[PDB]
Design a protein around this ligand. Structure first.
Ligand SMILES: Cc1cc2c3c(c1C)C(C)(C)C[C@@H](O)N3c1c(nc(O)[nH]c1=O)N2C[C@H](O)[C@H](O)[C@H](O)COP(=O)(O)O
Ligand SMILES: Cc1cc2c3c(c1C)C(C)(C)C[C@@H](O)N3c1c(nc(O)[nH]c1=O)N2C[C@H](O)[C@H](O)[C@H](O)COP(=O)(O)O
Ligand SMILES: [Fe+3]
Ligand SMILES: [Fe+3]
Ligand SMILES: [Fe+3]
Ligand SMILES: [Fe+3]
Ligand SMILES: [Fe+3]
Ligand SMILES: [Fe+3]
Ligand SMILES: [Fe+3]
Ligand SMILES: [Fe+3]
Ligand SMILES: [K+]
Ligand SMILES: [K+]
Lengths: 502, 162, 502
């Protein structure tokens, strides 16, 4: 009669209704400039559910699902961001083997369409900024399970632009996991079969954003193995109806088909009329700039399998300069940088934080602790290894243990006071490989490793003094009207400094 | 900066986080090709005429100068580590409180500005936060529940739409 | 009656007798300055077996076992050094689970001694150089299996100096796998139980030299898992008689006992009388210099288990500036650097060679191949990642695909012609962690990444021309007396250049 997923998006939406975190509406939102417009107003906030989408009579839209990191951590049972980083990096080393269920038990194969495959009829394309020309599908992760990923599995987002019916472009960032599959099978006569899944479980959304951490998660690893180990249950897969691949069974929409690497077409029409690359706008990019349109490879859809349309299956459109896109892309990357520093020398790095302000793959902040004289200088080995093993990182900052790693005014305080400009700035790979989106050697300038740590043994000269915020109580001096008047004007660095007394 | 060349520097902010005489942030605006490069003259003159400044940052006109996550965004994206870091006076006079030449390392002038003429490649896109109204979709109970979890860079980014 | 190992040192010695690679003698060699003296005369050559050792009536001594790499590769079934690197790095990713056999079936527990534990009575100490004062046991690898290595296993060499009977020093290089066990359990009241094994199987000798490659083989990995996967059969372990640990069952001598990290004593007597560290000689080190004596931790031997003395169990003493010590330490490290470069971006690095001349952890040479414009500049990411993830590397050189990586005059030809001294020299981590043996920042100068590769697209300007060495035949012009007179004066770069025609 009806099939139920284990830990899918519908079970996570019922958990948000129980905690009061879900905000729903029945007004007809527009996919053109109203979903991402409302996402930017409520950036880093509660999940917003749109029941009625314009020209989408069967689709529901969820947005701002990964906006607040306090409700992502409450969903997966994590106490804080330090408990989030140490448990995903534990779950990287112990992946769970994903199970394969039958085709009659998979909820995403309730409605299987093999003919009149109009992807823009069924999948919701959105427009982010008013300077765009085209409508972009960017809600799908790419599920490659089997011999094309060396017996492992891969999940990761790829943007689309369906302009020729069932054929659309498929943007692959260079050096990624999909780039390594494509460069291996470039000269193969057979196409590469993959599966794009929509409305995925949020553990599979979580590992989707993991990328350019390939010393920890290489080609041949189990990327849905980590998504099984985060939620505590293995992710159910199912065989495709047409192609010989595997999907995610607990999704809402699944596109099946083949990727043609040699067949390349332009992403936009106005960059197809003037056949150049790299100057014409498509949508914004991960840096907070605009991405440009290029000659992307083409994904040829052979089948659209989807849930029952009376049950209204859910898509997840999200902006790219939002805190959804920060907390998807930089959350396993916080753990994978923490896994690399614990691989090299354990016990030194205490916390790894990548904020919203350092884009997706732009930078990171680690926090080290020097126990003795031998461990002094190990953070310069960490910043060189982080900037080399992550492609296109430009700003790796190492701070000491007395710094709030989440307060961003505290990081600027370490750049002012604890940085020698002659010795503590590292430029490890000048002329290596960077990212071409964000503007025998290349044009990449090298990255920046900044050693804002104290030396070992000079901790008394660099000790931040602590005021007596616990020796006095403000309830003995003022009434509760005067406390909440005085506490409501505090924002920024003063919320962090009043807590620690620093 | 208005004495040296007027009309370029729009705003000067020194926050709590750059101590008293530790650093400053200026905000320049390049009107033409001749005024390009004037912010490197400003950062050398700020770091020399102020004794013991260690971190002078010049940013462009599309940056919130008070949001401190927006300054870190310019250090990630708009800074060449080979050319845009200035060390003007290595061995000069610094401050002995904060730890033919002295032990002062020189200060740091950071050019996080865009070049003139490359403003289209470095333009921050603006989402439609004024073309839509949130009162038409949710009631006022759901707005203040959703606005009370917003702090930090997202308060600055939701205002400008950036 | 008698127990037989699976793939131990006695089975490998019978394989060397069948191929004629074993050279035996019955003259009484001296452990003082005659074993390592004869090893230096026949450096990089056939294995030498000493049946009679002076003041050692039950011990046999093998030396130069890993001298020629052509007979190590013939032992494990490898065709060349390129087949050796790609198969060990395959065997790193797929370790074999080691089996545990009973105590009555282990051949190393035939003779178990628990009282009058004089280790210098039973284990052969050698002296390398005539400037030494003390006799050093340096033939044992350290087998730590269980909860002290996070459920994994570790094998690796440690030098000893037994001066107080059953108590001797235990030198741990800082930042190693044994250093990470020791810094975790430094403040523990219980001692660390480990097991030192002597006369090990040569697959376990092979992984013993793997170290400072901890982005590939971290703490918690299975180091005898790789030794099982190299020989194709799992390594048999057995429980210790006294302590709660595990040994290698197919060894010849096993020392059981506890390591005290807080109890530290001097390695030599003349550095114990004048209580300083770092200037008084112990034996030579891995660099080709002298190592100095320090305040090493102490290993307290509780039991000596050994094979039957009528069967004459075999020890393996080796010099440290020999080609044994090069081919033990730098053989898995060739594969682990190749595993790191295939993790970061596969298909680019073709070959990794670490020769005798770049010491153990001093340097490496990789060989890249740039397929297109996007892969140009990836070798600078490799040289920064090699120099950061390997502690104390000082000279990483990347060369192109038209270079002989084993001819060392061909590497100097790339330093002369293909190196820009302004752009192609990398100093990635100036002030990081190096090696204190080889002479907020430390005294380490940073290492040297040298980009001796050609640019992509400039391969026609940098193409080495090929002479017609295959279009002509020398048998048509000279007789066979004149060929072998003329070919016997060819050595060095001309043997490599006449083969390729370059
Ligand atoms: C969350 C999110 C992530 C990505 C993208 C978007 C969103 C919302 C779009 C705006 C739709 C367009 C861009 N986009 C995008 C992308 N990766 C690509 O290879 N190609 C892309 O066109 N990533 C990043 C990925 O999530 C991974 O970082 C990357 O795919 C590498 O990871 P992997 O290949 O190793 O799995
Ligand atoms: C082959 C060989 C290797 C080593 C040593 C010797 C030989 C002959 C001695 C002359 C006896 C003395 C030195 N010595 C030695 C040593 N490692 C130590 O921690 N301590 C040591 O006193 N290594 C190197 C090891 O084989 C590993 O490289 C190292 O142990 C790290 O590997 P691991 O800890 O990760 O397993
Ligand atoms: Fe992937
Ligand atoms: Fe983050
Ligand atoms: Fe510092
Ligand atoms: Fe101020
Ligand atoms: Fe700049
Ligand atoms: Fe080890
Ligand atoms: Fe070697
Ligand atoms: Fe070069
Ligand atoms: K991913
Ligand atoms: K080892």
């Amino acid at each position: 009669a009806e099939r139920v997923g284990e830990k899918d998006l519908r079970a996570a939406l019922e958990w948000f209704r129980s905690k009061g975190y879900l905000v729903e509406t029945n007004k007809e939102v527009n996919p053109d400039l109203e979903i991402t417009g409302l996402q930017k107003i409520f950036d880093g906030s509660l999940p917003m559910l749109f029941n009625n989408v314009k020209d989408m009579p069967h689709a529901r839209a969820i947005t701002n699902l990964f906006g607040d990191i306090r409700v992502v951590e409450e969903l997966f049972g994590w106490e804080n961001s330090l408990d989030r980083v140490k448990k995903v990096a534990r779950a990287i080393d112990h992946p769970l083997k994903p199970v394969i269920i039958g085709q009659d038990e998979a909820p995403v194969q309730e409605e299987v369409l093999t003919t009149d495959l109009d992807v823009n009829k069924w999948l919701t394309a959105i427009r982010h900024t008013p300077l765009e020309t085209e409508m972009t599908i960017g809600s799908g992760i790419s599920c490659v399970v089997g011999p094309y990923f060396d017996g492992g599995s891969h999940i990761g987002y790829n943007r689309m632009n369906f302009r020729w019916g069932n054929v659309g472009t498929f943007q692959i960032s260079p050096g990624s996991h999909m780039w390594q599959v494509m460069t291996e099978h470039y000269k193969d006569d057979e196409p590469i079969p993959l599966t794009m899944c929509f409305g995925v479980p949020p553990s599979c959304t979580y590992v989707a954003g993991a990328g350019f951490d390939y010393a920890i998660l290489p080609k041949g690893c189990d990327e849905i193995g980590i998504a099984g180990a985060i939620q505590g249950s293995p992710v159910r897969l199912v065989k495709c109806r047409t192609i010989d691949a595997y999907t995610l069974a607990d999704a809402e929409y699944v596109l099946e088909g083949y990727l043609h690497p040699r067949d390349k077409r332009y992403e936009t029409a106005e960059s197809e009329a003037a056949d150049i690359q790299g100057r014409f706008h498509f949508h914004p990019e991960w840096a907070g700039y605009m991405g440009k349109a290029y000659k992307a490879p083409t994904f040829h859809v052979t089948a659209i399998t989807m849930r029952r349309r009376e049950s209204k299956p859910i898509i997840f459109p999200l902006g790219v300069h939002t805190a959804d896109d920060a907390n998807i892309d930089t959350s396993v990357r916080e753990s994978a940088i923490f896994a690399l520093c614990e691989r090299l020398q354990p016990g030194i790095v205490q916390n790894v934080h990548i904020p919203y302000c350092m884009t997706d793959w732009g930078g990171c902040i680690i926090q080290v602790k020097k126990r003795n004289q031998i461990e002094e200088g190990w953070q310069r080995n960490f910043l060189a290894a982080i900037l080399a093993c992550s492609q296109g990182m430009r700003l790796a900052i190492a701070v000491s243990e007395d710094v709030d790693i989440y307060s961003m005014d505290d990081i600027m305080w370490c750049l002012t006071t604890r940085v020698n400009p002659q010795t503590d700035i590292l430029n490890p790979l000048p002329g290596g490989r960077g990212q071409t989106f964000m503007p025998s050697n290349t044009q990449f300038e090298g990255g920046m490793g900044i050693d804002a740590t104290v030396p070992y043994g000079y901790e008394s000269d660099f000790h931040r003094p602590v005021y007596g915020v616990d020796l006095v109580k403000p309830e003995n001096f003022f009434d509760a009207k005067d406390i909440d008047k005085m506490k409501s004007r505090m924002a920024g660095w003063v919320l962090s400094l009043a807590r620690t007394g620093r």
